[PDB]
């Protein structure tokens, strides 16, 4: 998920611009729901996942807001001490304490129901138990008890008219989520919201803690600790699932890292290219980042240094020359199937070879497979979400930075060989692999492009539509499931705000019993593909001027 907020000192022909691209994967019907709410203290417009009461993406004519996933470490696992003498109990603060338990029955269409028990301790629900070591692991979430408060904080924040009002609600949102603010005066802001534990001294948050009492959390950290900034001196706020702040720790997931190699740098490069950005320039960051190979910038210097003394006829050098001439933006050929340039395939083959020779070889099986992916993994239906730099690639990037990296190389991933030797060997593998498939004339290689699919199964893998309602787009784009843009105090209009979004395939998922799809079932699909957008209306006069239909209900509670 990405976001860029451009403040007064960086905006052209406006005081602030907010552009959000939340990445949830692509579904039919649409992941988000367009909605405007007017009355009872609200006056808002935007779109929101699963029609939640609170709009995650929207504005109220004074301020605008959005979100990207936070990925802070708000979850720790406690290793509970069990006893075979006392089934269902665990040791906590010197006493054997009874677990809470509940029975659940799964009813099954055309099958037999299954009953099972869920167990819970003071530290959270039990995930798994090892009968052999008499240990049960309990998952502790810092937001446990605050789920409903988080839903309501996301609703009440829609009425805020300033930073202080809005941060009062940000302090009540307990999930790990980056929240963003912009307003009519050109103020911009960011808070890495959520509840985070105040851990005992000595607690390494990447690994489980004993559950016997001494390692229990002290409580929750106060809102003053959450990373936040208001009107940064840079003039902008950019995020693509990267770290909020210097010295702030990421999620403990092994496949997740915040390091020198980060795709957010592609957004910084575009925001810093020119002194100021207009709304159209800010929106065009979506198209460019969507098509940007993320590995070229990271590895091209290493590839150029390794091939610098080779002869003109050496194929390992020619592969690198092909990359040097490229800006890493992928574009489809006219066939709608292949990419104009072969660089992503060259990078994928080379990186896959490099990871096999370096990080994978240093890690014991079966953990080595966590580090083998190049990031170009997908499927014929295309990527299920965003593309990123893989964990193995991020660790390889620190190795190839040598002493520029702050991470101690406790094991030399090159195993005592000169890095140039291994880089060149992966280039020889790459030429062999690709020239056998495509021939020796690189200029005619027509490598496969990734496509995009609006899946009829939701992100859980559960049908939310029939299979034939799946929708296909030829060009994979590494962008928001939806995109929305809010422009405050434009100089080209007298309106204090202008806003746009795209909710594809359309607003409606309704299909009548006879098969007749609704008039708004697919009317935003082509607009999504072509980087188009529709206007978000807020005022009564703008809504009325664009009205298609209306209903008046008369209801008593």
């Amino acid at each position: 998920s990405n976001m860029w907020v451009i403040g007064k000192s960086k905006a052209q022909d406006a005081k602030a611009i907010m552009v959000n691209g939340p990445q949830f994967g692509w579904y039919a019907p649409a992941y988000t729901y367009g909605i405007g709410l007017h009355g009872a203290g609200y006056d808002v417009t935007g779109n929101t996942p699963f029609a939640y009461p609170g709009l995650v993406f929207g504005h109220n004519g004074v301020i605008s807001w959005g979100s990207t996933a936070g990925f802070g470490d708000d979850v720790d696992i406690f290793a509970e001490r069990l006893s075979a003498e006392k089934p269902g109990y665990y040791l906590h603060n010197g006493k054997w304490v009874k677990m809470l338990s509940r029975e659940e029955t799964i009813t099954v269409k055309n099958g037999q129901a299954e009953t099972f028990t869920v167990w819970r301790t003071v530290h959270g629900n039990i995930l798994q138990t090892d009968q052999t070591t008499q240990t049960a692991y309990a998952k502790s979430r810092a937001w446990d008890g605050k789920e409903v408060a988080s839903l309501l904080a996301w609703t009440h924040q829609m009425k805020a008219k300033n930073w202080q009002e809005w941060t009062q609600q940000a302090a009540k949102q307990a999930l790990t989520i980056n929240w963003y603010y912009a307003d009519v005066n050109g103020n911009i802001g960011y808070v890495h919201t959520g509840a985070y534990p105040d851990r005992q001294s000595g607690h390494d948050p990447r690994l489980p803690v004993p559950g016997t009492g001494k390692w229990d959390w002290k409580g929750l950290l106060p809102f003053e600790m959450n990373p936040k900034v208001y009107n940064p001196q840079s003039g902008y706020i950019a995020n693509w699932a990267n770290s909020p702040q210097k010295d702030y720790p990421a999620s403990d997931l092994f496949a997740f890292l915040w390091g020198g190699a980060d795709r957010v740098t592609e957004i910084d490069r575009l925001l810093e290219q020119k002194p100021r950005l207009t709304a159209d320039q800010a929106w065009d960051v979506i198209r460019q980042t969507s098509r940007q190979d993320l590995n070229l910038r990271l590895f091209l210097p290493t590839l150029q240094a390794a091939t610098s003394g080779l002869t003109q006829s050496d194929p390992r050098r020619q592969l690198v020359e092909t990359l040097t001439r490229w800006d890493g933006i992928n574009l489809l050929n006219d066939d709608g199937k292949t990419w104009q340039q072969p660089g992503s395939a060259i990078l994928n083959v080379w990186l896959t070879s490099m990871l096999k020779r370096t990080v994978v070889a240093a890690v014991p099986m079966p953990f080595d497979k966590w580090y083998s992916a190049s990031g170009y993994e997908t499927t014929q239906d295309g990527p299920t979400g965003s593309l990123n730099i893989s964990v193995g690639a991020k660790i390889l990037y620190e190795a190839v930075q040598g002493d520029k990296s702050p991470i101690p190389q406790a094991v030399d991933l090159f195993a005592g060989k000169p890095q140039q030797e291994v880089v060149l060997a992966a280039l020889e593998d790459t030429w062999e692999t690709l020239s056998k498939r495509y021939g020796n004339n690189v200029s005619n290689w027509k490598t496969p492009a990734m496509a995009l699919t609006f899946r009829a199964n939701n992100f859980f893998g559960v049908p939310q539509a029939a299979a034939e309602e799946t929708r296909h787009q030829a060009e994979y784009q590494n962008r928001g499931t939806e995109n929305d843009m809010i422009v405050f105090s434009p100089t080209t209009s007298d309106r204090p705000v202008l806003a746009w979004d795209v909710v594809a395939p359309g607003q409606s998922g309704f299909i009548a019993p006879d098969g007749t799809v609704d008039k708004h079932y697919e009317d935003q699909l082509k607009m999504y593909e072509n980087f188009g957008r529709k206007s978000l209306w807020l005022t009564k006069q703008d809504v009325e001027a664009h009205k298609e239909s209306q209903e008046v209900l008369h209801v008593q509670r």
């Binding site: 009872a40 269409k109 948050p205 936040k228 770290s243 909020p244 049908p463 509670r557």
Partner: protein, 207 residues
């Protein structure tokens, strides 16, 4: 006028709700959601509560168990019961609005029942505040804000200490899964602020 709810849809079908109190506003929202996305919402309900196998069969049993194992529904219901009347009106109004449209669908299914219910072989039931809360809770909280791999991390650390020795194995874990990396690009620049806490990075909880 306190009973009045005006729904206006624009040229892309997007609904705009006009009402004079909290319950009525969220009632209009629920109503339009049930018109536009009833099947999607029903399947999201089942996904968030682990009741998919009831309608789709044996391939979703493990799914359903895993959803139920990852939350404590009575705790969610206790948070709902603690709400003020104003807050409760948001959830209650939303549920009540969906139900007004569901009841219309079930009274004239020949023209109003989304085709997918016929394909999948079942009919929609009413909603309560807990179900609306669980759409959010089961997506944003129980899945999106619930990420840990500490048991796998410990298995990698054990394998690294077996391969490299206790000290080098801990240091290789710090190379592959560093706690913090000062070269990470940060949304907040260092001139503005930095996070003040420093964390143990050698599994000292079991030292």
């Amino acid at each position: 006028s306190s009973s009045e709810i005006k729904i206006v849809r624009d040229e892309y079908g997007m609904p705009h709700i006009y009402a004079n109190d909290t319950w009525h506003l969220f009632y209009g929202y629920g109503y339009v959601v049930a018109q536009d996305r009833l099947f999607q919402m029903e399947m999201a309900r089942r996904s968030t509560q682990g009741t998919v196998a009831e309608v789709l069969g044996k391939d979703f049993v493990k799914f359903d168990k895993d959803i139920r194992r990852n939350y404590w529904p009575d705790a969610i219901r206790a948070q709902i019961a603690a709400l003020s009347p104003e807050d409760m009106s948001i959830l209650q109004g939303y549920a009540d609005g969906m139900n007004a449209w569901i009841d219309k669908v079930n009274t004239n299914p020949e023209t109003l029942l989304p085709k997918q219910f016929n394909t999948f072989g079942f009919t929609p039931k009413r909603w309560e505040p807990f179900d609306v809360a669980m759409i959010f809770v089961g997506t944003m909280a129980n899945r999106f804000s619930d990420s840990t791999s500490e048991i796998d991390n410990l298995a990698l650390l054990t394998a690294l200490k077996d391969k490299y020795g206790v000290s080098q194995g801990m240091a290789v874990f710090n190379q592959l899964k560093w706690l913090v990396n000062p070269s990470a690009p940060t949304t907040i620049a260092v001139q503005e602020s930095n996070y003040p806490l420093k964390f143990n990075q050698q599994n000292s909880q079991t030292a």
